[PDB]
Amino acid sequence: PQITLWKRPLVTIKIGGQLKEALLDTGADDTVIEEMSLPGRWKPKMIGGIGGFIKVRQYDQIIIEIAGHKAIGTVLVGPTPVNIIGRNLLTQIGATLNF
Amino acid sequence: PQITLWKRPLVTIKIGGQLKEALLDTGADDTVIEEMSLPGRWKPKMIGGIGGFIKVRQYDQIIIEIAGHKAIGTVLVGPTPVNIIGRNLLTQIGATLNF
Numbered sequence: 001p002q003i004t005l006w007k008r009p010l011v012t013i014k015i016g017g018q019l020k021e022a023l024l025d026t027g028a029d030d031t032v033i034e035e036m037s038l039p040g041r042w043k044p045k046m047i048g049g050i051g052g053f054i055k056v057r058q059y060d061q062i063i064i065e066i067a068g069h070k071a072i073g074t075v076l077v078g079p080t081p082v083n084i085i086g087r088n089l090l091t092q093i094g095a096t097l098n099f
Numbered sequence: 100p101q102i103t104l105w106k107r108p109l110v111t112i113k114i115g116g117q118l119k120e121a122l123l124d125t126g127a128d129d130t131v132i133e134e135m136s137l138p139g140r141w142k143p144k145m146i147g148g149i150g151g152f153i154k155v156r157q158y159d160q161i162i163i164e165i166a167g168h169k170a171i172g173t174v175l176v177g178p179t180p181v182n183i184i185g186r187n188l189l190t191q192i193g194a195t196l197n198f
């Protein structure tokens with residue numbers, strides 16, 4: 001699809017068996033999801049942006065379905081105000097910015 | 100252009116006669132630039148990023164070039180890790196996300 005930016009580019013994702021809404025975010029290096037359980041090992045990380053930093057759990061090799069497209073990669077889990085699909089997964093679905 | 104996302108989508112902007120680097124950020128509603136002088140009056144605004152809310156200075160109807168495209172719109176000035184071009188100006192340059 002071609003998604004315009006008049007509104008937030010929100011899509012449906014499936015992660016850990018759960019359906020969520022998330023933002024397709026070219027400004028995010030990595031994918032960040034609101035607190036949930038995921039299987040396997042994790043390690044702590046701090047990530048920062050406007051307003052400062054938050055502590056997250058870094059889970060590697062996690063599958064997400066993004067608008068119907070399967071991708072695998074790292075997912076950070078923590079107290080983000082919005083679920084964010086970052087570049088690490090946007091690349092896997094072939095997403096581009098065009099103008 | 101068609102910009103892939105393996106790297107940060109950094110572009111050159113021109114504001115106030117100065118060249119700066121900025122990030123094309125589809126997860127940002129608004130355009131946020133580091134401290135600089137801009138003409139005219141400003142209004143207060145609070146924005147909520149990943150780590151919390153901050154105060155910024157809102158300047159309306161500012162001339163800004165983005166990757167060679169002309170925009171005139173709202174620029175927020177305040178402490179951000181990098182200059183970010185949000186959807187308010189991404190729409191003016193005709194940007195869409197595609198996959």
Ligand SMILES: CC(C)CN(C[C@@H](O)[C@H](Cc1ccccc1)NC(=O)O[C@@H]1C[C@@H]2CCO[C@@H]2C1)S(=O)(=O)c1ccc(CO)cc1
Nearest residue numbers: 027028029030047048049050126127128129146147148149
């Ligand atoms: C500031 C950027 C360089 C990095 N951000 C991605 C942005 O699109 C970030 C995504 C986001 C975060 C919280 C709430 C809503 C959206 N938008 C952002 O700050 O936009 C600001 C905040 C205001 C609400 C959204 O638009 C307004 C302008 S981020 O801090 O969320 C981030 C930082 C580290 C990682 C890990 O790589 C992922 C995301």
Ligand SMILES: [Cl-]
Nearest residue numbers: 072073074088
């Ligand atoms: Cl990854």
Ligand SMILES: [Cl-]
Nearest residue numbers: 091094103104
């Ligand atoms: Cl590619």
Ligand SMILES: [Cl-]
Nearest residue numbers: 172173187188
């Ligand atoms: Cl605007």
Ligand code: NA
Nearest residue numbers: 040041060061
């Ligand atoms: Na894992």
Ligand code: NA
Nearest residue numbers: 139158159160
């Ligand atoms: Na103004």
